[PDB]
Amino acid sequence: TISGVAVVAVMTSPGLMFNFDPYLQTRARIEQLEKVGHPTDKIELIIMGGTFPAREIEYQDWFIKRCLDAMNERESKSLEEAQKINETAKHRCVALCIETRPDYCSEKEINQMLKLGATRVELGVQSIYNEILKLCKRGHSVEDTIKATQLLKDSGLKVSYHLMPGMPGSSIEMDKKMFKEIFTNPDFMPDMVKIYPCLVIEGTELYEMWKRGEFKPYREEEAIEVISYAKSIMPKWVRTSRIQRDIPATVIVDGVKKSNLGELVYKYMEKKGLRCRCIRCREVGHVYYKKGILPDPEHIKLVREDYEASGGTEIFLSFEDVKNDILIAFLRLRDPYKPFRKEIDDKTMLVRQLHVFGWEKALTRDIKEVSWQHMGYGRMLMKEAERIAKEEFGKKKILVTSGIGVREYYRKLGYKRVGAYMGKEL
């Protein structure tokens, strides 16, 4: 399926073909997507490596600047100028995701990520059990994950967890309990999870453990059982990544090698009667592609679900066909717990995300182009968020975490730049 948002994933320096040049990587991906008719007016930029927040600030600012230069199609004098230019460019950076180790997620680093324009942070959690983390000689603790998650949430950012079932020392039941805990213990409650079973790749510590007879990775059966469980209990407010990996099968010494693990999980869940209600399974574009149906307007409602997370309250607002369970748009509103950013006080509510599922060329059906943007759903969710913030929680200002290329949208709704955010006085 072709999405309206182009994902541009780039690699930082210690990809290979361009010597890790940020501009060349970004440009090459955009041109490659244009070659196949994919829209590139909206770009999600993903910074891969996991060590980016530990690099020199000089390097971080330059790297992001040059990615934006490629989107803007012109040179700039500074990061700030490239960001300003990009607000009205032909290729707008609507989201910026930074991958990082949980222990590289201090207040100082979060300040830097906000300066860069980040909207999402993916934590290399892997496991929530310190026994497993220490056994595999990982460089972080679950305490690091818990603290990073709270600091990110209280700064308005989206939080994703990379999780690895089947690590040394774990078990099917241990993995299942981990997923239950991540969605029902307020220390965690991520917005998004990226799941793939632990693999044995030559040259890693996991390879050494495997060589010694300390590690037998999951085969397909076990991975399917764990991931199927995880999806069956995922809350409606959790977004999941397409189950896959960019690692070719010839480098996998041991572990799951087949390329359709996601499809195998789907068929397993069908066989067992396991339903999935998370964002990816219910979003309008995915439902049309998988099941050939569209939202029934007689049954579209504004729905609300609250949960406790990182000491505060998350409000998940959505427009949904509640007869067919099809998700059209959603907004993540947070009453923060212990913020540190200068622009967030105890009378502030945070809009951490607004997403209206938009254009999408489903090549395999007959209704070619389908979209729910420009129909009012985004504006209606914002109005409801403002009402809740003011009337129910007594807040006086609301701050939106906005992609660089989305600021203009919030300006139309009366918001103005407040530090790193778009803000409105209630």
Author numbering: 74 to 87, 123 to 534
What do the study's own words say?
Elp3 acts as the catalytic subunit, but the loss of any of the six subunits results in hypo-modified U34 tRNAs in yeast, indicating that the complete integrity of the complex is important for its function. The enzymatically active Elp3 subunit of Elongator contains two functional domains, utilizes multiple cofactors, and conducts a unique uridine base modification specifically found only at the wobble base position of tRNAs. The current model of a radical based Elp3-mediated cm5-modification reaction is proposed as follows (i) Elp3 recruits SAM and cleaves it to generate a 5’deoxyadenosine radical (5’-dA) in the rSAM domain, (ii) Elp3 hydrolyzes acetyl-CoA in the KAT domain and (iii) an acetyl radical is formed by the products of the two domains and (iv) is transferred onto the C5 position of U34 in the bound tRNA molecule.
Although DmcElp3 and Methanocaldococcus infernus Elp3 (MinElp3) share 50% sequence identity, MinElp3 harbors an extended N-terminus (aa 1–75). We further generated five different N-terminally truncated versions (MinElp3Δ1–19, MinElp3Δ1–41, MinElp3Δ1–46, MinElp3Δ1–54, MinElp3Δ1–68) to facilitate crystallization. We solved their structures using a poly-alanine model of DmcElp3 via molecular replacement at 1.9 Å, 1.9 Å, and 2.1 Å resolution, respectively. Although all three versions contained various lengths of the N-terminus and also showed no signs of degradation, we could observe interpretable electron density only starting from residue V72 in all collected and refined datasets. Therefore, we believe that the N-terminus adopts a highly flexible conformation in the absence of substrate tRNAs. The overall structure and domain arrangement and interface between the rSAM and KAT domains of MinElp3 are almost identical to DmcElp3. The main difference relates to the Fe–S cluster loop region (aa 87–123) and the Fe–S cluster itself, which were both completely unstructured in all monomeric MinElp3s. In our MinElp3 structures, we could not locate any bound Zn-ions and instead observed the formation of a disulfide bond between C384 and C389. In addition, we observed that the acetyl-CoA blocking loop (aa 466–486) is positioned outside of the acetyl-CoA binding pocket, interacting with the last visible residues of the N-terminus and also contacting a neighboring symmetry mate.
